[PDB]
Amino acid sequence: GLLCYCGKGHCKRGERVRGTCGIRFLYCCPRR
Structure with missing residues (x-):
């Protein structure tokens, strides 16, 4: 989607990592 959220273990394709939370x-911020 297009909403930042805390990924478990690691973000998935489409999401951009922006640290930890x-x-x-x-911290994962997807652009799709």
């Missing part, structure tokens, strides 16, 4: 959670 939780235990084993990283």
Whole structure:
């Protein structure tokens, strides 16, 4: 989608990582 959210373990294709925001959670901002 087009909304940032904390990815578990790692973000998936389409999402851009922007740091971390939780235990084993990283900031993911998808553009699709």
